[PDB]
Design a protein around this ligand. Structure first.
Ligand code: MN
Ligand code: MN
Lengths: 426, 434
């Protein structure tokens, strides 16, 4: 793989090559990508979507904003070192270290843009609707991969659809740079085969059958290595994933302490190695509020993990470029012991808290209900009832079903509740 | 002081003495007292009243009823064990007069069952809402038409004193209220004094007062029959506590100390990580740690800890009572039984943890703030209606809430205090349009 091709400024439908040395740096293609996401309706809808808990708790937007800030640091630092490793990238082709930060930042900002309401239970509720719910009727009218798209409905693949979806008057969706689309794709494979290896890149899939032709174009332009289609990941996708990993590990922990779900004493206990070399003890002892102490620990822990993740990337750079790196960056951390205890305590005290369990069980019913109304109106567009269902909710069979799943996933948590209540009369 | 008189079976209005030796043991006056409380409307209303944590439907929280049940079971056990040792010390009590050890358990059980029956809703904010209403609120108006003690009853309104009123209030067709035995009324009365003088000492019996001016004549009859020792020779009357009142108090101390902690752990207000650190001295010699470690639910681990600690404190309290029995009988004991505990420091640590994690939790603070407005509102509407009973709105307030000036104000306070948490909030909500 060549870094010159991985940093493609191509946008969908382009008929001519876009050279980095010819860009107006006030309107750098990569930085425009960030701006286009910020102003888009799917990104705005993350305002009203839940990260884990439904006081102050992170939403998907605040989470995605934090991931994109950590991603920008990761990208800037790795970029600076990539340019010194391969000076021809700057001296011949005109790349600057802020381009790498721009690509990671925009990819990170978009990384959860396709996730449904109710988080990852929402994804499972949609897949369950097709595996065992009303949606099972379509199994024999779908290909294996079309049906696998639905029963393993994947927010990452839905995000790729959201970003690139064509409609009349808007070909190519947000029309992001191919480099940014590359850095977004952390599972560059279709739904089948299911987990062909133990690599994190094979854990899920990254695009629906409906988007396969589009990612084939992205991968061709980027020069991704071929690995049923799948490719070795764009190197920058490891930094997006690292940023995301860092944020939800540390920030969910912080949230759980401030919510009273995790006793505060665990904070220093699990984070002391992560902050020991950089913490100002006099500052820490002077801070009077739990929230101020835990936010200080979090800033230090995140900075420690950013630095290590940059070093892990550079150490394994050629292995990532050859598609032979077998782990995530955070899997290689020296703090893996502490990261594990943090995640396990978060799972115990937050993810399995009664209120989270209750919301996730309720979301199953809410999404199963909205999906069944949509599919029934699709099957019988004739009855009076199904004509009203269409005015209320939606004013090839595979393409109809994948669009039904996509539209349900654009719904905020609140809006999913209201439309569900009306269908049931509440 | 004499135990024969302290164990009086007299009921209010008795024209002839009731000898213990002539009682039917299947209808023992002290055990009839317990049953009369169980079936009384005031005790039933405790079912719908918060003890400390606001009630919910998502979790079990102790109500005033469940708390009072637990205190009477702990008190019955204290009275039984203290009774047997008292009958062994004064065997004339059984061999001549016919007292049995279960008599003492019955007196303490009944007084304990009733000990919180007069408390206003929403906790001690309820009491201070009532007090401040007459100190500086609308109630200030009446100060000059009231004696210093009548007024003190209002500005320092006390649920213990309202409990005594509740238990003995005379109404048409029902003179003497529940008509409990004087022994039970003596065990109930932990502050045997009027509202003034205010805290004349550091003794726990002088921290508050135990009866309103409207009940003074009744408690004078009670203290005379029991032979309680005088603690004042002025026109401000006061008496040494009935010895069994020390056992009611200890049962109460034991239950809210250990059981508030238990509730705080089960509700997640106190981290479970603290359970063994705070209980280890109370349970260390009797706990079966293998059994504790085999229990798989938090609520089971903490109920095991609670039952061990309560057992520990019951035995110790029985021993403390008997070691200080003559001082208590002479009215010279100056503290509570629990104050003398060898676990005093651990009890204090548990109580402070509960204050920090439960009483200062947001929900308990929110409730006390809400209570202050709900009760102040109800008191304002009752008292305005009392002053101008002619207006149409005040006739409605009378129909909604209540279908001598002091006797009216003390009755309004008693009626507001015996409202359940829900009825008070509903009436508040309607007075304010919701
Ligand atoms: Mn994320
Ligand atoms: Mn009590």
């Amino acid at each position: 793989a060549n870094w010159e091709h991985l940093l493609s400024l191509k946008r969908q439908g382009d008929t001519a090559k876009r050279l980095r040395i010819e860009q107006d740096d006030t309107r750098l293609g990569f930085e425009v990508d960030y701006d286009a996401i910020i102003f888009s309706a799917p990104f705005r809808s993350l305002q009203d979507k839940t990260q884990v808990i439904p006081d102050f708790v992170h939403t998907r937007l605040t989470h995605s904003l934090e991931v994109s800030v950590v991603g920008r640091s990761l990208g800037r630092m790795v970029g600076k070192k990539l340019l010194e490793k391969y000076p021809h990238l700057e001296q011949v082709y005109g790349y600057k270290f802020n381009d790498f930060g721009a690509i990671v930042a925009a990819a990170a900002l978009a990384h959860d843009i396709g996730n449904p309401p109710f988080g990852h239970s929402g994804e499972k509720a949609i897949g369950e609707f097709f595996k065992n719910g009303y949606g099972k009727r379509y199994k024999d009218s779908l290909t294996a991969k079309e049906y696998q798209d639905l029963i393993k409905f994947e927010g990452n693949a839905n995000g790729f659809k959201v970003l690139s979806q064509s409609k009349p008057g808007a070909q190519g969706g947000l029309r992001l740079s191919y480099a940014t689309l590359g850095a977004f794709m952390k599972y560059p494979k279709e739904s089948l085969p299911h987990k062909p290896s133990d690599h994190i890149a094979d854990k899920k899939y990254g695009f629906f059958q409906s988007e396969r032709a589009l990612f084939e174009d992205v991968a061709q332009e980027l020069g991704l290595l071929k690995r049923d289609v799948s490719w070795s990941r764009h190197p920058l996708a490891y930094l997006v994933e690292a940023a995301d990993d860092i944020c939800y590990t540390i920030i969910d922990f912080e949230d759980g302490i401030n919510l009273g779900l995790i006793p505060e004493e665990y904070a220093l206990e699990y984070m002391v190695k992560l902050v020991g070399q950089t913490i100002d003890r006099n500052k820490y002892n002077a801070l009077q509020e739990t929230s101020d102490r835990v936010s200080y620990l979090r800033a230090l822990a995140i900075g420690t993990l950013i630095n290590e993740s940059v070093d892990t990337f550079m150490k394994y750079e050629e292995e990532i470029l050859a598609g032979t790196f077998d782990q995530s960056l955070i899997d290689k951390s020296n703090y893996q012991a502490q990261i594990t205890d943090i995640i396990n305590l978060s799972i115990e005290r937050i993810y399995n808290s009664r209120e989270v369990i209750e919301k996730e069980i309720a979301g199953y019913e809410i999404l199963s209900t909205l999906l069944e109304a949509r599919c029934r109106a699709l099957d019988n567009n004739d009855t009076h009832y199904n004509q009203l269902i269409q005015q209320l909710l939606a004013p090839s069979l595979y393409e109809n079903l994948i669009q039904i799943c996509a539209e349900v996933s654009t719904m905020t948590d609140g809006k999913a509740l209201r439309n569900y209540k009306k269908i049931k009369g509440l």
